[PDB]
């Protein structure tokens, strides 16, 4: 590697105006589904992002009290933080938290069977291996091939029940990893439903 004044030097760089230009355009843009992205422009994104949350992360307790002092033989922790204000407010702060518990048992009764089968002393059956298919590494490998190979993925949908037959997951992957791949639905089996229903679904998916 031949020594050079190139390297050590700064290659790319950005204007302090141009940051102020690009930070605004996150606010403006606006996507349009009939439009589609070919190239992205190389941009220092970590500078342009961080938008305003209104909440903050939680405080770091480990710094103030370790663990050995929080509980043990070593244990320097006589009184609780933050602790309650007053014994009216404590007894107020119990009685709702009782009834909130007493709710969840009456709820998770009606959600249910699962315990009563264990009390009766029997288990539910084995799930059949065919209901997996598929799933399987051999075919999902075959999937991530053709996404990587293709320049427009298209995604065919059963025009009886397209919401059930969509899948999320891949579309969430595609936007994160590979935005240059274009993506487009095809409702088909448009015979097997009535004519208004197909016309509706293309409206609700367009």
């Amino acid at each position: 590697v031949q020594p050079d004044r190139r390297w050590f030097g700064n290659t790319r760089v950005i204007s302090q105006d141009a940051l102020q230009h690009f930070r605004s355009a996150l606010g403006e843009t606006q996507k349009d589904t009939y439009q589609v992205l070919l190239r992205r422009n190389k941009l220092p994104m970590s500078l342009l992002e961080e938008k305003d949350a209104d909440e903050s992360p939680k405080a770091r307790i480990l710094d103030t009290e370790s663990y050995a002092d929080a509980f043990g033989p070593k244990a320097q922790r006589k009184r609780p933080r933050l602790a309650a204000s007053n014994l009216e407010d404590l007894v107020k702060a119990t009685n709702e938290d009782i009834t909130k518990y007493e709710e969840k048992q009456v709820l998770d009764a009606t959600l249910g069977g699962n315990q009563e089968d264990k009390e009766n002393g029997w288990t539910s059956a084995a799930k059949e291996a065919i209901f997996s298919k598929g799933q399987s590494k051999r075919i999902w490998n075959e999937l991530y091939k053709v996404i990587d190979s293709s320049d427009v993925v298209i995604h065919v949908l059963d025009a009886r029940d397209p919401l059930g037959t969509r899948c999320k997951s891949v579309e969430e992957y595609m936007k994160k990893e590979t935005p240059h791949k274009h993506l487009i639905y095809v409702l088909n089996k448009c015979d097997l439903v009535p004519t208004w229903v197909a016309a509706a679904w293309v409206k609700h998916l367009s």
């Binding site: 141009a18 941009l43 305003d52 903050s56 103030t64």
Partner: protein, 488 residues
């Protein structure tokens, strides 16, 4: 250099058309106007034709019967000040200026060399913008003549670093906190050791705050207050050179101390606790404020800019006697103090729980509001001089503007790349300077909520800044050794 990308073939033909003009059509529609103060009072209905915002002063000034000019706003959705009426009745929101203009600080004067170490602190004199002291990691402090850009008495005494410094509000005495155990009082003019050094604290000194003038008797010097890493606070008398009462409520180190309006010390400390401390009880606690999940860094007051300067307003034209200095110190205080005709000093804190609580300690030991926003720790907090906006510096490279009265979020300043260490205001309450872990300092237009001007200069980290009270001059100091002064 990555660019702002070019205008398209259509966007040229947009520009090539003649368009617009400012015009003002005539303009005379009779639209009704209400007048409202931001303090409290509503004052009831006029209905004129449309006019320039210079004239709506002259409509008000005869009605109230003053000659006080006034700043205007409208639509509070929106919040934004014919110039309104183009955006489409108007509730007009009037508010006093304190009439001024401090300029945007643009150019450097060339870099003043001196002591061969990092610069740890840097305080202007109150009364004039020529005089400015710096404390370095070299054991010398140094006072700079800032008009001539050159050293006025290179100053020696200590045998460790000098961490904080402060100029007394009357402007007789400088005080210098140290990494050893000591404080040394100095005269600016002579630059000589006023007796033996003040020794009392066992570990290093964290901050130094002066007793402000309007409390102190006319013809007595102001007492110092000094917080230290052992966690005590002592109150130093300058003449006798001896502490009256040690105060030892806090268990951990005290991060900063401030002397308040009404005889009341405040001490922000590493035991997650803010101790309101009455002077008249002769070293005694009155109220103990607990919110924070981490330790407390820094503690800003609403009055702190007025208490720091103490009588010397922007001209720097001196008090003829102490009895005058009493009244001048009281009048600059009572510009900001009587907001609704009542002395409601606001206190605010920063801490590593990523949060600032807002306090009014005389009225209630509860907090008012929880300013929550930042990702990493807030470090410096500052009220604006007029007690109207708060702003706080943080380690997530961004400075957040909060309304002072109700602790309500306003906006965020974005621009800084690396972590922001401290900030300071222009006296007119418009411009706002900030300093970073990177080279650059930046100055922030508070009215439009925007970057006014970036200024690069230094070779390394920049720890300290301060704005001069007149608002010609801004100092800076950091790791590259060189003091840079900045001006218009």
């Amino acid at each position: 250099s990555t660019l702002i990308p070019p205008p398209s073939k259509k966007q040229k033909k947009e520009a090539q058309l003649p368009r617009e003009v400012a015009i003002i059509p005539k303009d005379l529609p009779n639209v009704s106007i209400k007048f409202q103060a931001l303090d409290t009072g509503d004052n009831a209905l006029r209905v004129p034709g449309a006019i320039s915002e210079k004239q709506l002063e002259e409509l008000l000034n005869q009605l109230n019967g003053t000659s006080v000019p006034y700043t205007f706003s409208c639509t509070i959705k929106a919040s934004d000040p014919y110039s309104s009426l183009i955006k489409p009745q108007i509730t007009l929101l009037y508010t006093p200026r304190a009439v001024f203009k401090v300029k945007p600080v643009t150019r450097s004067s060339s870099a003043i060399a001196g002591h061969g170490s990092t610069i740890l602190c840097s305080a202007f004199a109150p009364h004039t913008s020529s005089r400015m002291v710096t404390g370095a990691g070299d054991n010398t402090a140094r006072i700079w003549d800032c008009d001539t850009q050159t050293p006025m008495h290179t100053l020696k005494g200590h045998y460790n670093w000098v961490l904080c410094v402060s100029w007394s509000p009357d402007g007789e005495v400088i005080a210098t906190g140290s990494m050893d155990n000591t404080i040394r009082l100095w005269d600016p003019k002579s630059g000589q050791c006023l007796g033996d050094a003040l020794r009392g604290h066992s570990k290093w000194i964290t901050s130094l705050s002066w007793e402000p003038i309007h409390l102190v008797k006319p013809g007595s010097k102001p007492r110092l207050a000094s917080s230290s890493k052992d966690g005590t606070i002592k109150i130093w008398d300058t003449v006798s050179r001896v502490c009256q009462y040690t105060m030892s409520g806090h268990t951990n180190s005290v991060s900063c101390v401030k002397w308040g309006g009404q005889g009341l010390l405040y001490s922000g400390s590493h035991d997650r606790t803010v101790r309101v401390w009455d002077i008249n009880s002769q070293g005694r606690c009155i109220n103990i404020l607990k919110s924070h999940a981490h330790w407390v860094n820094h503690l800003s007051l609403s009055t702190d800019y007025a208490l720091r300067i103490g009588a010397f307003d922007h001209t720097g034209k001196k008090p003829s006697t102490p009895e005058e200095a009493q009244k001048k110190a009281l009048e600059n205080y009572e510009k900001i103090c009587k907001k609704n005709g009542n002395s409601e000093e606001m206190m605010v804190t920063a801490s590593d729980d990523y949060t600032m609580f807002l306090w009014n300690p005389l009225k209630s030991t509860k907090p008012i509001a929880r300013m929550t926003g930042h990702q990493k720790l807030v470090n410096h907090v500052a009220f604006s001089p007029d007690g109207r906006y708060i702003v706080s510096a943080s380690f997530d490279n961004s400075i957040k503007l909060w309304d002072g009265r109700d602790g309500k979020f306003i906006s965020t300043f974005r621009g800084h790349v690396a972590s922001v260490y401290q900030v300071a205001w222009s006296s007119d309450c418009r411009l706002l300077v900030s300093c970073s872990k990177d080279t650059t300092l930046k100055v922030w237009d508070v009215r439009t909520r925007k970057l006014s001007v970036d200024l690069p200069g230094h070779k390394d980290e920049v720890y300290t800044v301060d704005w001069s009270v007149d608002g010609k001059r801004v100092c800076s100091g950091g790791k590259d050794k060189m003091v840079r002064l900045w001006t218009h």
